[PDB]
Amino acid sequence: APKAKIVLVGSGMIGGVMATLIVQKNLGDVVLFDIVKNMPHGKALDTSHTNVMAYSNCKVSGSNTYDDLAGSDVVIVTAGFTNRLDLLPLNNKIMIEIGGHIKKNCPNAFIIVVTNPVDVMVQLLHQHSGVPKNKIIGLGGVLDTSRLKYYISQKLNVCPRDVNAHIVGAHGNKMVLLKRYITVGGIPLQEFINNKLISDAELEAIFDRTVNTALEIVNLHASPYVAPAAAIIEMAESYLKDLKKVLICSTLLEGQYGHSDIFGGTPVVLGANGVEQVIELQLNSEEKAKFDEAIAETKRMKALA
Amino acid sequence: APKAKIVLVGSGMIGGVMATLIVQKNLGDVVLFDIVKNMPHGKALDTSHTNVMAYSNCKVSGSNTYDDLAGSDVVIVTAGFTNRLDLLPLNNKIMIEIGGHIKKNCPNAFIIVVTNPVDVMVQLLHQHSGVPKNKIIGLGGVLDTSRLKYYISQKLNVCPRDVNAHIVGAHGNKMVLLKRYITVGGIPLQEFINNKLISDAELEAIFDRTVNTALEIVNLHASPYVAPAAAIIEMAESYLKDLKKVLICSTLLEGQYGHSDIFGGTPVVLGANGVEQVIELQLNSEEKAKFDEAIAETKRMKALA
Amino acid sequence: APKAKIVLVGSGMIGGVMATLIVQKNLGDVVLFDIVKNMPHGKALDTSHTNVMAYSNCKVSGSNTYDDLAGSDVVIVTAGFTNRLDLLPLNNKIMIEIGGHIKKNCPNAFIIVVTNPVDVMVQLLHQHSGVPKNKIIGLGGVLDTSRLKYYISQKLNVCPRDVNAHIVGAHGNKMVLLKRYITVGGIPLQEFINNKLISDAELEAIFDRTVNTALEIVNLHASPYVAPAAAIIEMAESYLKDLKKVLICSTLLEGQYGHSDIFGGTPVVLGANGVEQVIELQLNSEEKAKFDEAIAETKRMKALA
Amino acid sequence: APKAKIVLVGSGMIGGVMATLIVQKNLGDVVLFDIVKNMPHGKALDTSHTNVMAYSNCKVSGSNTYDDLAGSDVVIVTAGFTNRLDLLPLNNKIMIEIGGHIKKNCPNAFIIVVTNPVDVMVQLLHQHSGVPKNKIIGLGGVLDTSRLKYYISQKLNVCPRDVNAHIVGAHGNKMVLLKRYITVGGIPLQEFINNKLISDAELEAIFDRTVNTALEIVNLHASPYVAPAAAIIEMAESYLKDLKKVLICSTLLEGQYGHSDIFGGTPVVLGANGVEQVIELQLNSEEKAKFDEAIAETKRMKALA
Ligand SMILES: CCN(CC)CCC[C@@H](C)Nc1ccnc2cc(Cl)ccc12
Ligand SMILES: CCN(CC)CCC[C@@H](C)Nc1ccnc2cc(Cl)ccc12
Ligand SMILES: CCN(CC)CCC[C@@H](C)Nc1ccnc2cc(Cl)ccc12
Ligand SMILES: CCN(CC)CCC[C@@H](C)Nc1ccnc2cc(Cl)ccc12
Numbered sequence A, B, C, D: 001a002p003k004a005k006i007v008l009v010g011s012g013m014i015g016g017v018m019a020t021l022i023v024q025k026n027l028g029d030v031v032l033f034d035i036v037k038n039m040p041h042g043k044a045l046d047t048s049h050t051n052v053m054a055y056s057n058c059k060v061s062g063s064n065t066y067d068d069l070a071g072s073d074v075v076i077v078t079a080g081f082t083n084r085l086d087l088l089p090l091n092n093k094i095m096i097e098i099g100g101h102i103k104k105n106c107p108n109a110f111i112i113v114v115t116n117p118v119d120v121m122v123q124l125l126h127q128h129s130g131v132p133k134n135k136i137i138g139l140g141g142v143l144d145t146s147r148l149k150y151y152i153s154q155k156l157n158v159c160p161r162d163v164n165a166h167i168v169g170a171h172g173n174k175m176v177l178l179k180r181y182i183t184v185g186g187i188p189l190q191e192f193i194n195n196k197l198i199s200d201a202e203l204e205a206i207f208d209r210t211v212n213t214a215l216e217i218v219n220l221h222a223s224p225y226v227a228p229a230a231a232i233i234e235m236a237e238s239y240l241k242d243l244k245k246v247l248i249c250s251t252l253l254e255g256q257y258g259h260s261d262i263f264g265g266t267p268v269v270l271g272a273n274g275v276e277q278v279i280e281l282q283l284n285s286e287e288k289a290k291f292d293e294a295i296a297e298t299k300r301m302k303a304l305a
Helices: A013-024 A039-048 A050-054 A084-105 A118-129 A141-156 A189-194 A200-211 A213-219 A226-240 A285-302 B013-024 B039-048 B050-054 B084-105 B118-129 B141-156 B189-194 B200-211 B213-219 B226-240 B285-302 C013-024 C039-048 C050-054 C084-105 C118-129 C141-156 C189-194 C200-211 C213-219 C226-240 C285-302 D013-024 D039-048 D050-054 D084-105 D118-129 D141-156 D189-194 D200-211 D213-219 D226-240 D285-302
Strands: A005-009 A029-033 A060-063 A074-077 A110-113 A136-138 A245-254 A260-271 A274-278 B005-009 B029-033 B060-063 B074-077 B110-113 B136-138 B245-254 B260-271 B274-278 C005-009 C029-033 C060-063 C074-077 C110-113 C136-138 C245-254 C260-271 C274-278 D005-009 D029-033 D060-063 D074-077 D110-113 D136-138 D245-254 D260-271 D274-278
Touching: A005 A013, A013 A029, A013 A039, A013 A050, A013 A060, A013 A226, A013 D013, A013 D226, A029 A039, A039 A050, A039 A060, A039 D213, A039 D226, A050 D141, A050 D226, A074 A084, A074 A226, A084 A118, A110 A118, A110 A226, A118 A136, A118 A245, A118 A260, A118 A285, A136 A260, A136 A274, A141 A200, A141 A226, A141 A245, A141 A260, A141 D050, A189 A200, A200 A213, A213 D039, A226 A245, A226 A260, A226 D013, A226 D039, A226 D050, A245 A274, A260 A285, B005 B013, B013 B029, B013 B039, B013 B050, B013 B060, B013 B226, B013 C013, B013 C226, B029 B039, B039 B050, B039 B060, B039 C213, B039 C226, B050 C141, B050 C226, B074 B084, B074 B226, B084 B118, B110 B118, B110 B226, B118 B136, B118 B245, B118 B260, B118 B285, B136 B260, B136 B274, B141 B200, B141 B226, B141 B245, B141 B260, B141 C050, B189 B200, B200 B213, B213 C039, B226 B245, B226 B260, B226 C013, B226 C039, B226 C050, B245 B274, B260 B285, C005 C013, C013 C029, C013 C039, C013 C050, C013 C060, C013 C226, C029 C039, C039 C050, C039 C060, C074 C084, C074 C226, C084 C118, C110 C118, C110 C226, C118 C136, C118 C245, C118 C260, C118 C285, C136 C260, C136 C274, C141 C200, C141 C226, C141 C245, C141 C260, C189 C200, C200 C213, C226 C245, C226 C260, C245 C274, C260 C285, D005 D013, D013 D029, D013 D039, D013 D050, D013 D060, D013 D226, D029 D039, D039 D050, D039 D060, D074 D084, D074 D226, D084 D118, D110 D118, D110 D226, D118 D136, D118 D245, D118 D260, D118 D285, D136 D260, D136 D274, D141 D200, D141 D226, D141 D245, D141 D260, D189 D200, D200 D213, D226 D245, D226 D260, D245 D274, D260 D285
Parallel strands: A005 A029, A005 A074, A029 A060, A074 A110, A110 A136, B005 B029, B005 B074, B029 B060, B074 B110, B110 B136, C005 C029, C005 C074, C029 C060, C074 C110, C110 C136, D005 D029, D005 D074, D029 D060, D074 D110, D110 D136
Antiparallel strands: A136 A245, A245 A260, A260 A274, B136 B245, B245 B260, B260 B274, C136 C245, C245 C260, C260 C274, D136 D245, D245 D260, D260 D274
């Protein structure tokens, strides 16, 4: 069947929601892969029954063998151990193992990396898998901006999706939030600030909140996995359905912002041909300085893998 | 049942698509009303069967009696005769007749006016129906900008919805297209122009195309009714589901842009409380001059009704 | 792009709704083809703008040249002149012309025939196009049963889709309604009759209503095209998304019900491989007698083409 | 806002998926309530961001105070300790506490009970909350039959939703699977058995699999919560949107099947008025004997609470 085959390399919390959302949207057949014995089979069985409730027809199966990567159209990697820097070499080993199988079983698959630090892990897998630069991206901006877009929408009382924002450079503490590129209903946010509808102080607090959301969720005795999963599926769906959505993801930089041979967060266009366009925001020197900071941290960690 | 009741006052071409789209989205019960005998019943019967194909449960009935306006949550007016100025007094008579029944049968319904010239006809109905200012709007910007957003998206090869634009003042020849407020993926269009991805000349042609689309469709031996219907439903749905989307519609101006006691196109926020916010774009003197032109034409025609 | 290409051979009323529904569901690129100059271009332009309102990315274009059949994944034929028997030879000529181009431009496309009498016209196109038997079907049962399912659901006050029914043999006056195969929520209808929830007399009236619905809609000064379009799209979507839905359509009979070398309405399974299964209902002699009647009328008209 | 308010009393695994699915479907505002400090707030924050990805506008908040039950339109109870019979009195205490607050804060809310044993726990809450019989149901048949419908659909290679089946009496080991009431595309399953498309032996194995699915998932080192959540949402959605779907749920029996003053699984119709119809299947003596067995076990456990 010409039905897309989506292999989720890692059957943890994010993997579970991704599987659920795929069936809900009837995106394609799903394989929940992991090295943990049977668990992926158990989650796959549970999820497979939702086909009835959702009027879908997507096979959902578990797997403990890399062989099931064969025929994969899309591969989503969430696998990985969770100082923080001590995991770098370890997770690189996981990227190496996965990359070798991708190269052997599905060299033409579209890859989405989630493993943290994503900006580092994505380039590592790109290198070990050998896939073209336009066929591999990392999760970052879609998730990070969903927080900023959401918090602003609540203050302004408008549909969350009506707020657009851009966070670039890298996923994580060094993420670059661009106040200048925020709009509401397509209108520059500054107009709403001029109107006293939202203050600069309110925005600064929202910015800090955005950068520290994962930490905030963790401190509330939970962990972020639902939004990450939803952000990942928006990306995968844009590719599978050739939507050509403009989404901020970690992609290989070839001179943009003055950086090369490194992956960084920036808006790109995802369609049937993968990363069809890499958009370079015309940042000013101040924003560029922050982007530089993001890249520096990515390079720092890359060197330790 | 707490199911919304949507009464379509006018069962023509736009009315038919609206009915179809309502069932597709299971938005609520539909009444296709018109003075033409039986036709609304015939279209209603045809459309009612689609409930099976769409897994919906919306009653779709025809009507030839104004009494069916009772219990209406949303009323959509497309009725109206189609120089052009000679129809003004005639269509005003239709607005008067409809307004009297709305006032009597559903004073708390949310009204959307389509009848042209919409900016004139909407204020007339507002006056004859007596509903609050936040409960009546006219179709305009959503439809007009859908053209501009779509044409630009094709030139740039991105998802149509990713292009945001603003057309204000009035629906029609005097519509004000604001080049300065166009974005792609939330990014100012000017950046794409600086990049040679789209030229100023290309945009000028797209602008003219946008203003003359209805005429273009008519010259191709067709008439626009599908997009208008879809634009209307996006508006009605934002209200019914309390989405709080920022949509450009004709609303009563109370000083915005320097105009009062007149309806004009401008972004507003539609939610459970109707027009929850009227957004005033901070236009420069040049854009304001064009808006003035739009209002002037509306006043001109209003005076002839 | 791996986006499906759907060519609508005939840009009339049914064609328009199909185009609209395809964009709503983001099913694939659409081509509105017809011999009428420009009209398809005009309808295509109007419909194309709805991509913004629906968050879709489907190209919608018009066409006046058969060449655009190239690359077609799905072809839907509604073209055709509308005694009634005098049109048979004329419409056969249309089927011949279309069939020659399908054979030349898209021999592997999946074909859905709507032209009436569908059961006759579908076999004619099958013959002239040369496509495999599993790649061509005619619209019939999905539309006819949607009426029966809907009317029964209203009497019983249950979701329309919860009522399942089977109408076979042929589309049209000789359609075979099988009372014995009607269920509500999967429960045999007879149980509801035993319960006095619906009477046999009520059902008989609903049956007559079902058979005469087109005529009823026509007498109300309208024409059925919305449900037909929706029924057609349910079929096309099952194929495109490999849903494997059980849908009653006109398919080539190879001995089922005692008939061969003729097309007739019967439940089939539509998936990525087209007609993946032809299901033969185990009818009793009485039901079989009626089916025979349906086939006889189809053969009668086939002989006059 | 006239937006429905859904309070999830219990913020565990099933609660999380329910919250996620509600936003995906934009069903209404969600409150994740639990006695565990902050966790519901953490899950609520994570889930709230998905509003952007799903184009929804549903508030998702956590809560540690029963007061938030005020204004609730729908209340879903999953809270509860997890011999097995020793938990009965304990879980009854939870039902009592919740029931008192429902009675005080939202007496007109529609209640769905999940806590096991559901058939027992649902009647207990019905008693402690005092809500009308038509406003409270327990999860059972929708989940159980989704397994049976799914397994059969895979053997027959048809859309999962096209297989309809009925499991009644009680949720759990004593569930009554009715082979006689299974259909495929509305066609009696027996016809497919006569055709050798599926054997009686295959079905017997599927039956055992259906009854032991939770156990099977648990043995694979997982736990069922995704399907349960999806089944619950289908029920809640039928009520909220007045779909009037026929769904098998635990409801108060008033003489049906010969049982009274007890809750049992049976098809019902859920609409704006809650349980609008309780459907009694015309079971034979053999099926009735099994149903009796189910009720007996429910009564046994009820007596120990
Ligand atoms: C002792 C166990 N070892 C080595 C035999 C297993 C392999 C270890 C490294 C390479 N890979 C992994 C380690 C841990 N988890 C993983 C999850 C997925 Cl999905 C894929 C690979 C993983
Ligand atoms: C001769 C016929 N006349 C007067 C009796 C009918 C009423 C005329 C004016 C007021 N109204 C109308 C005229 C024409 N079309 C309409 C469509 C709708 Cl939906 C509602 C009112 C309409
Ligand atoms: C005089 C005009 N003639 C002959 C040149 C045109 C061709 C006539 C027959 C074969 N075909 C047709 C006749 C009428 N309508 C049609 C609509 C479609 Cl979409 C496709 C073919 C059509
Ligand atoms: C020692 C802690 N006790 C008593 C103070 C808390 C209350 C205990 C019983 C009645 N209720 C409960 C016990 C355990 N979990 C629950 C989860 C939810 Cl959502 C609601 C009520 C719960």
